[PDB]
Amino acid sequence: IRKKLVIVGDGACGKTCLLIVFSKDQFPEVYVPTVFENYVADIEVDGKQVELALWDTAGQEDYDRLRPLSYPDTDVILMCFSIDSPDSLENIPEKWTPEVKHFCPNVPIILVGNKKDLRNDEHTRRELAKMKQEPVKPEEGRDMANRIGAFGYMECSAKTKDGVREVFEMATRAALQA
Amino acid sequence: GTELIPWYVLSIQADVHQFLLQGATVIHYDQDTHLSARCFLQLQPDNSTLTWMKPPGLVEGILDLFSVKAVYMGHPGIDIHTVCVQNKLSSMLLSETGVTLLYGLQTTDNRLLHFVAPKHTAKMLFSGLLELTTAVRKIRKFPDQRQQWLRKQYVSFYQEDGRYEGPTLAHAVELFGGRRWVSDSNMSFIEFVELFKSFSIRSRKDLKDIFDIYSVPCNRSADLQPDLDLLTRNVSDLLSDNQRQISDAIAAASIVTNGTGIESTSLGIFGVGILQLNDFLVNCQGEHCTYDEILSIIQKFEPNISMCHQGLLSFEGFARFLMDKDNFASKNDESRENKKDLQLPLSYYYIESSHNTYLTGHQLKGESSVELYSQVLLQGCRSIELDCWDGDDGMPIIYHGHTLTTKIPFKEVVEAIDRSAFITSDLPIIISIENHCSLPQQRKMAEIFKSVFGEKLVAKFLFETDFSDDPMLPSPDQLRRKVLLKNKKLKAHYLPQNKKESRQIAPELSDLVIYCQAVKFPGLSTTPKCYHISSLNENAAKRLCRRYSQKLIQHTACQLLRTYPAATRIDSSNPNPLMFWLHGIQLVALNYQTDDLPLHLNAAMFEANGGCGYVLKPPVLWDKSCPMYQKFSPLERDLDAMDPATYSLTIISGQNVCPSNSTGSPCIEVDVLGMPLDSCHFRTKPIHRNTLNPMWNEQFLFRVHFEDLVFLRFAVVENNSSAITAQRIIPLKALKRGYRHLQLRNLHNEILEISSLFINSRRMEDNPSGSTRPASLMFNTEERKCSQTHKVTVHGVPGPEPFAVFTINEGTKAKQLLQQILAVDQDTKLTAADYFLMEEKHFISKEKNECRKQPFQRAVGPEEDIVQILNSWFPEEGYVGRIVLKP
Ligand SMILES: Nc1nc2c(ncn2[C@@H]2O[C@H](COP(=O)(O)OP(=O)(O)OP(=O)(O)O)[C@@H](O)[C@H]2O)c(=O)[nH]1
Ligand SMILES: [Ca+2]
Numbered sequence A: 001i002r003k004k005l006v007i008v009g010d011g012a013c014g015k016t017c018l019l020i021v022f023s024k025d026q027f028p029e030v031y032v033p034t035v036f037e038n039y040v041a042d043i044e045v046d047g048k049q050v051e052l053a054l055w056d057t058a059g060q061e062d063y064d065r066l067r068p069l070s071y072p073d074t075d076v077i078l079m080c081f082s083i084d085s086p087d088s089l090e091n092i093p094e095k096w097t098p099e100v101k102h103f104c105p106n107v108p109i110i111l112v113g114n115k116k117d118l119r120n121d122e123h124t125r126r127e128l129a130k131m132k133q134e135p136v137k138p139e140e141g142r143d144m145a146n147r148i149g150a151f152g153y154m155e156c157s158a159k160t161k162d163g164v165r166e167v168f169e170m171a172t173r174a175a176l177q178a
Numbered sequence B: 001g002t003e004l005i006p007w008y009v010l011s012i013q014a015d016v017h018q019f020l021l022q023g024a025t026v027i028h029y030d031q032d033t034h035l036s037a038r039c040f041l042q043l044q045p046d047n048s049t050l051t052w053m054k055p056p057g058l059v060e061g062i063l064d065l066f067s068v069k070a071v072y073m074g075h076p077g078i079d080i081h082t083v084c085v086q087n088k089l090s091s092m093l094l095s096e097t098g099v100t101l102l103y104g105l106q107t108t109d110n111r112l113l114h115f116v117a118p119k120h121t122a123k124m125l126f127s128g129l130l131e132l133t134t135a136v137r138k139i140r141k142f143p144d145q146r147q148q149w150l151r152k153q154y155v156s157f158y159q160e161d162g163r164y165e166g167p168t169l170a171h172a173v174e175l176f177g178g179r180r181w182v183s184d185s186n187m188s189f190i191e192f193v194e195l196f197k198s199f200s201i202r203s204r205k206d207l208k209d210i211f212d213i214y215s216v217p218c219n220r221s222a223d224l225q226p227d228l229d230l231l232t233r234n235v236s237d238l239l240s241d242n243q244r245q246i247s248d249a250i251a252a253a254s255i256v257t258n259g260t261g262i263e264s265t266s267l268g269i270f271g272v273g274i275l276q277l278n279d280f281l282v283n284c285q286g287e288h289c290t291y292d293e294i295l296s297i298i299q300k301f302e303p304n305i306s307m308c309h310q311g312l313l314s315f316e317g318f319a320r321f322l323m324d325k326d327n328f329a330s331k332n333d334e335s336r337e338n339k340k341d342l343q344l345p346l347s348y349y350y351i352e353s354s355h356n357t358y359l360t361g362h363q364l365k366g367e368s369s370v371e372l373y374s375q376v377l378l379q380g381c382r383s384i385e386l387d388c389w390d391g392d393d394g395m396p397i398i399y400h401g402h403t404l405t406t407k408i409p410f411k412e413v414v415e416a417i418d419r420s421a422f423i424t425s426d427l428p429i430i431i432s433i434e435n436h437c438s439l440p441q442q443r444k445m446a447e448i449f450k451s452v453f454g455e456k457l458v459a460k461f462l463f464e465t466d467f468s469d470d471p472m473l474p475s476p477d478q479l480r481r482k483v484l485l486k487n488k489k490l491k492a493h494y495l496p497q498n499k500k501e502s503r504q505i506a507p508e509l510s511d512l513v514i515y516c517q518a519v520k521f522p523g524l525s526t527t528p529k530c531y532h533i534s535s536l537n538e539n540a541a542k543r544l545c546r547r548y549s550q551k552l553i554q555h556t557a558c559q560l561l562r563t564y565p566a567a568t569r570i571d572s573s574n575p576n577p578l579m580f581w582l583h584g585i586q587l588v589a590l591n592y593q594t595d596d597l598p599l600h601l602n603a604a605m606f607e608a609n610g611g612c613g614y615v616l617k618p619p620v621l622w623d624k625s626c627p628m629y630q631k632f633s634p635l636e637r638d639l640d641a642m643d644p645a646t647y648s649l650t651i652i653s654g655q656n657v658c659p660s661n662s663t664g665s666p667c668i669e670v671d672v673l674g675m676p677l678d679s680c681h682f683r684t685k686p687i688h689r690n691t692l693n694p695m696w697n698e699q700f701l702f703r704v705h706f707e708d709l710v711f712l713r714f715a716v717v718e719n720n721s722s723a724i725t726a727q728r729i730i731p732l733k734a735l736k737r738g739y740r741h742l743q744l745r746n747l748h749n750e751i752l753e754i755s756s757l758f759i760n761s762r763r764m765e766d767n768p769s770g771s772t773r774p775a776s777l778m779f780n781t782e783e784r785k786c787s788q789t790h791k792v793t794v795h796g797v798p799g800p801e802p803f804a805v806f807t808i809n810e811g812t813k814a815k816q817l818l819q820q821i822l823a824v825d826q827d828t829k830l831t832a833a834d835y836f837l838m839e840e841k842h843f844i845s846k847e848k849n850e851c852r853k854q855p856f857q858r859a860v861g862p863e864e865d866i867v868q869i870l871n872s873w874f875p876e877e878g879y880v881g882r883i884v885l886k887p
C-alpha cells in the first residue's frame, strides 16, 4: 500500500525544508530554489504501515508552467504557507484552490503552517513593522482551511521539528479512507 | 534538418556528397515495364531519402536509403541498348554508366532500382551512393541505437501531417511510454532527445538500488560506434541546467509505477568515487581497470561539471554508466573478424549454409527469386544451393523440380552470386549443385561458372598442402575470396520424389569440382577421405547421430558433412540445428525465407567471429590435446564423471519489453539450448500492465557441462495473448559477467532500438576436492588454457596511485604476485618477506545511517592461488573484497 501527495506553498516558506527534515532529520543550511522533487518515505499510522510518496512543487513564475506535472490524480494534495507572511495567508489559498479543484477534484486538502518557530522571534516584529504587518495568527489559519474546504489545519517547524510528524500521520490516514 | 544519417557516420567526399545533394539528370529504367524515362534524382537535406522528378513510378517516386541492401554498377538487368534507342543516345557501356540499388523491406522482397547516367555522372553517383549505403550498413549493426530511433520518430512526426514541426509533449511523453496525458508545443530535436534521456534514467528503479549500495556521502560541491552517436556518453554534446531540471521533472512525473523520482536534497547527495566505483567493477562486473581508466570513466559519464571535477559519479553518471554500449550482455556486439581462428583446416569450422536459396516461400508453390541469392549472401551465408534442371531453350533454369515454383534463368543466378558473394565477408562460399541436367546443358553450365566467377572459382589444388599423404582442406583464410562448388565428380581411371540427380555428368562441369566432391554417404557402421562432402537430410543425419553419435564426431572432424531439411517439411520450415552442431556437422542448411527459432540460432551463432560465416568448432572436437577427445557423447542423458560450471542468472528488470503495446503483462522465458543433459527452461512471474519498466527480479540457476556450445534464449511473452514479442539468443560463452543490459529483437530477428533487459549473470564454480574434475578443465584444451589471463587489483602498491591492476596467469600464486608488485619498484630495495598480501571484505550495505562495520581481515598464505580467492567474493552477501598489500 503506497500513497501519493502533492505539496504547494508561497515559495521561500519551507516547502522543501519540511520534506528534507522529515525524510532526513536535518535542517537545510543553504537555500536553493526548487523546481520539481519527488521523495518516498514510510509512515505508520494507527497500526497501518503505508509507504508515502512526496511530490514537491514550485511557485516561481518560470516554474509555474510545469506545475501540472505532479497534478494528475493523487490521494491527497497538501497546502503550506509561511506564518510570518500574511500575504501567503490570503493569495495562496485563493490562488491555488481553483487550480487544485480544476485539475483534480475529489482530493482532500490539508493546510500546514510553516515557520512556526520564528513566529515569536523579535526580528520578525521589526521586519513586519516597516510593512505594517504581524505574524499569521493561529485563529485565521484554521478559518482559511475551512473557507477553501480542506481536511484540517496544522502547524510545523522545520528547525525545531515540532509537529512535523503529526501532519503526515493525519494526512496519510485521510488518503486511505474516503 | 535532423540528418537521418548523421555527418559523423558518413565518410563521403565533400564534392561527391555535394553532387547528390544538388541533384543530377539520370535515366530511370523500369524492368517490369521495360521502358526507360528521364528523371532528375536528388538527395534530400536529410541523407535518407532519394527523390527523382521530371527534369526542369517511372518518373515520379522516392527511395528510402535505409532499405537499400547494396549498390551495384552495371547490373546486367539494365538494357543499355534499350535505353540508347529509347533516348537516342550514343554508344554506352553498361559496366561504366549503370547504377543499381537492391532495396527491400524483408529478406524475401528484393526489388531493384536502375539508373543510367553519362560516364562522369556515374562515378560520382555510384561513389557517393556506395558510401551512403555503407553508412546504412553500419548503422544497422550498431549495438546501441537509441539515438537512431529518435531521429526516425522525430522526422516521422515532422512529416506526418505535411507540416514541418516537432511533436508535442503529450505525444513525446506517450511515445516514450510515459503517462497518457497541453501546456507546451512543438519541441526541437535537442529538447526531444533531452526528454528521452530523462525517461531512460528516471524510469529505472533497479539502477537506483545498485547505486545506493555502493554510493558514499561525498557532498555535491567541492571503427566502433562513434561516441557522438552514443546517447549516454557525455561527449555527445552535438541547454542550461534550468531546462534539464524541467526535462527530468516531466519525465519523472509521467512514469507510472517504477520510477526513481527526482530527489534533490542539498548537503545530502551521495556519489560513487574512484574507489567506490572500483569496488563495483571488481566484484559485480569483474572488470579490472587501472586508476586512469576508472577516472576516465568518471570524466566520460558524469553529466554535472561539479561532480565530474571532483572525481565523483552521481546517479545520472552511474545510471548512464550501466546503460552504455560497453555494458551490454553479449560480447559478440562489435565483434570483428579474428584472423587467427581462420587458420585451422576447413573441416573444423561451422559454416553458415542455406537450403533453397532461390525459393522465397513455400517450396511447392511460390516464387523463385534471382536476387534472393544476393540477399542471403549479404547476410553472411557461405553456402548456397542450385537446382539446375533443364532449359526449355537449352539454357539451364533453377527451380524446384516437378513443382509449380517459378523458374529463374541459371545464367542470372550465377551472376547474382558474383555481384554480392564477397560484399559483407571474404571467406569462401561453397555452392551445392542439385544437378538435374542433361549432358548437353552441363557444358553450358560450366561455361557460365568459368565465364562469371573466373578467378574466384577454384579449378585445381591451389596449395601444396593438398598433396600431402593425408591432406586436410585448406584454412578459410587461405581460400579468402574464392568460390567452391560441390557435386558428383567423375571417378578418374503429393510429395515430389525428385531427389535423384543426373546419373551421367559432363567431363567439363565435374572438372570444376575440387575441394568438395559430393558422394553418397558410405556409412559409419560399414582421393583422400577429407574431400568427400556427403549430404544427408535431417532424418538421415538425426537417425545417424543417435545410433552412432561418438563415431560421427570423429568423422565430421576430418571431412565435411552437409544437412538440409527433410522433404516432409513442405511448409519450408527448419530443423533445430543444435542436434547436429554438437556432432561436428558443418553445413547445417536452413531455409532463410522462414523466420523461426531454428533460424535465429544460426544467426545467433554466426554473429560472432566478425560475422564471416565460419565459427570454429568447440575444442572437444577436432583436437587431440583435449583430454575429452574421444569420450564425448552428446546424446548421453547423464554424465556424473565431471563437475559442471554452475551458472546463476538474475532477470533484474526490463525496459520497453512490449514495443507498440503499452498495456501488457510480459514474462521473460529463459531457455538453455544445449545438449539434452544441460538444457532447461525458466519462467518469471508475470507483472501486470507494466511494459515500460517491468521488474521481476527472478533468479535462475543452471549447470552446464559442455559450455562451448550452449545458447541462452530470452523471449518476452505476454500472458494475456501468450504470443512472443521480443527475443534474443546469445551463447553462454559470450555473456558478460555482472550487471549487463541485453538488447532484445523482434520475431524477424531485427534489432529493437529501445527494448532491452537488465540482468545479473555470475558464473559460479564448485570447489574441486579431487573426487571429480571441473567440466571446464576437461573440455577446454590444454593449449587454450595458456592463452587465458586474469587481472587482479592490488591496493597499497608503492606510488601515488591508490591501486594498480596486475595481469597474472590462472595458476599464479600469492608468492609470485608479491614479486610482480615489487618488480616494478626497482628504485627502492624492498624485501619480499617484508610484504604480505591481505584480503579484506568491506561490509557495505544499503543502510548508511549506522556506523560502518569493521572490515574483515585475512592473510593470503603463500602457495594459495590468487585467482581462486577472487572467485569466492559474492557481493550478494553484502561485502566487497580487496587484495590489499601490507608490510
Ligand atoms: N527558522 C526557520 N526558517 C524556516 C522555517 N520554515 C521555512 N523557513 C525558511 O524558508 C526557507 C525554505 O526554503 P526551501 O527549503 O527551498 O523551500 P521553499 O520555501 O519552497 O523554497 P523553494 O526552493 O523555492 O521551493 C528556508 O531557507 C528557511 O530560511 C522554519 O520553520 N524555521
Ligand atoms: Ca533442392
Ligand SMILES: [Mg+2]
Residues within 6 Å of the ligand: A015, A016, A032, A033, A034, A035
Ligand atoms: Mg523548494
